[PDB]
Each structure stands twice: as C-alpha cells, then as structure tokens.
Amino acid sequence: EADVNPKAYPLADAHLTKKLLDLVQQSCNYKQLRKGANEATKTLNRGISEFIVMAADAEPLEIILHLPLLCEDKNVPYVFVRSKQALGRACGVSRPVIACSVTIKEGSQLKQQIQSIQQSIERLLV
C-alpha cells in the first residue's frame, strides 16, 4: 500500500531527501534550477548538470528512466526521492515535478553544498 518501484534506484532515505529538497529549494533561489524531465534531458545533453533528482512515484516510472542512462553517459550523479509532490514543492512550483536538474554555475555561492550532495549521492551509487 503500495511503495516503492525497485527500479527507482538509488533511493534517498529520510535524512538525504531532506538535504536534497533543501538544496533544490536553494538552487531555485539562486537561479541554478531546471524543472522538468524535458529540461533535465537538455541539461545532460549539454553537460551543464551538477546532479539530477527524480521522483519515485512518477507513473509510469519509465517516463524518466532515460535520465539514469543519460547520467551514466555523462558521469553525472542522480537520485530518487519518494514524492513528486514534495519535489515540485521544493522546486517553487505549484504542481508535481518528476525530475529536475541543478545546473553548473561558475562561482556559485552553492559550490560547497552542491559538491557535498554529489558526494552523498555518489556513495549510494557505490
């Protein structure tokens, strides 16, 4: 009842989800956020993504499963959070968001937090 698609790998725990959503909110405030699977795709193809966050309850999940494949291509960290409602809430948007991308910005006041999250993600992807 009902959770959670095994294919939504890697999945953040409660503590990491909180960090991710915080940083996604900041990224938004600092103009470093792309909202939406389509725009995420564009960031990856262009090599301007710091990391990708996707929603585990996207239905069907395959509408974003191209992203991990793209990320593997580009050596780019990606993670899943449980709730698209929460991600959209963190994206400063008034509808769910199934995927978003924090973008590379030279001199970003957020370099340190972004770098930190990348490590957090990387250690789940082993």
């Binding site: 795709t41 395959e62 974003i64």
Partner: protein, 239 residues
C-alpha cells in the same frame, strides 16, 4: 544492433509515400487524357479512386450509364443520373483504340498500386505495434515510423525532449512544423488549433516513446490512456 527491424519498417512505410506520389501523378494523367472524351466528368466525380474506377467502367461508351450494376458499386445513384444527364450534352469525342489502351493500362496500374499501399501499411501497422505500440496508438504507425527514422531508433528518440520531437522532420511552407504537425490526428483539427495540438501530441508521444523504449505496457495501456487524454482535450478546445 546489426540490422535492426525499425529500419526495415521505416523504409516500407516510406514506399507507401512513394506509392501515393505515383498514384496521384496517375490520377492527374488519367483525368487529363479522359478529358478528351468526357471533360465534365472530373468535376462531377472529385474523388480519385471513384473517378479512375468510373473511366475504367465507361471507356468510350457513355451510354453504359443507365442501369449499370457495376457503376452502382462506384457512384451514388444520384450522382449516376447527374453524369448520365451530363453525358448526352457532352462536348468531348471518341478516343482511338490507342488512346483507350493508354488509359486502361493507367487505370489498372493505379488500382494495383492502391491495393499495394494497403498491403504494405498492414505490415507497417502490424510491426510498429510490436516495436513501439504506445507511440503508434497516438500518432498512427506511419507518423511513428517517420519520426523513429529521423531519430535513428527508439532509444535515441526516447532521450530527446518533447520540444525537439515536435520538430522532427521539419523542412517556403510553415515554420516550426514537423511530422507530428502533419499527422492525421493534428490535421483533423481546425487550422487555429493545430500548433497547440502538435505541442500536446508531441508531449505525450515523448512519454509513450520512453515507455516503448523500455518495452513496457506492451498491450498499449499507456498509449490508449494518452490517446483518451488527448481526445478529451481536443473536445474541450472545440464547440
């Protein structure tokens, strides 16, 4: 890898396009040559297949119009009598045996081409519904195959954003319009609702493509759902 199916289907689907081009070059030819015999007939029978069937049925003898059971399988009884009337007050004149051979051969070839188009599309519909069933349900097999061709297959297509899939096959005609814009489903709408319809259809095609790229929802559940969603938006835009 190594001779993938989609390419065979893309090129089969392309044949029907070539077949249509020949088919209306033949129509144009037949209407031009038959005009010596019955110049009026073309404006009474606009539809290309009916026309071709009609000149094939009639030939030189325009009094084959009355009580002709074979004609009744081609034309409306009402349009029969309007052409029968127009037949006597006529203008045109008889053709030579060589002028008839010319038309008869062209009519038989056109009929033959028309049946081949159908038999090739059957193949294309059959195989597309295995390769990309959810995509095919939304835009038809023909449009699905066209965009899959230019994208270089399903995996490539699936990693494109909806806004570029919208512009696949784009070309002095109409700016920013792709295969999707010119699909039966979009074109079925009033002109002023088309750009918006292409956007919607492009967006859902992208979603369907991704599902197909992973070989999920193989009975088309996702495609029929998106199709229903699109239809309900089209209804809501119109009156």
């Amino acid at each position: 890898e190594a001779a993938p199916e989609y390419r065979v289907i893309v090129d089969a689907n392309n044949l029907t396009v070539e077949i249509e081009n020949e088919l209306n070059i033949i129509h144009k030819f037949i209407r031009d040559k038959y005009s010596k015999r019955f110049p009026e007939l073309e404006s009474l029978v606009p539809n290309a297949l009916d026309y071709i069937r009609t000149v094939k049925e009639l030939g030189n003898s325009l009094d084959k119009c009355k009580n002709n059971e074979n004609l009744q399988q081609i034309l409306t009884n009402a349009t029969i009598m309007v052409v029968s009337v127009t037949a006597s007050t006529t203008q045109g004149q008889q053709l030579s045996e060589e002028e008839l051979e010319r038309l008869e051969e062209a009519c038989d070839m056109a009929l033959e081409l028309n049946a081949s188009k159908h038999r090739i599309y059957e193949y294309v519909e059959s195989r597309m519904s295995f390769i990309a069933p959810n995509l095919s349900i939304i835009i038809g097999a023909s449009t699905a195959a066209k965009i899959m061709g230019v994208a270089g297959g399903l995996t490539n297509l699936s990693k494109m954003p909806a806004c570029n899939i919208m512009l696949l096959g784009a070309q002095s005609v109409l700016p920013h319009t792709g295969y999707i814009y010119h699909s039966d489903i979009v074109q079925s709408l009033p002109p002023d609702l088309r750009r918006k319809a292409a956007r919607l259809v492009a967006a859902k095609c992208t979603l369907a493509a991704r599902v197909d790229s992973f070989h999920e929802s193989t009975e088309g559940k996702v495609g029929y759902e998106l199709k229903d969603e699109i239809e309900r938006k089209f209804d809501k835009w119109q009156e």
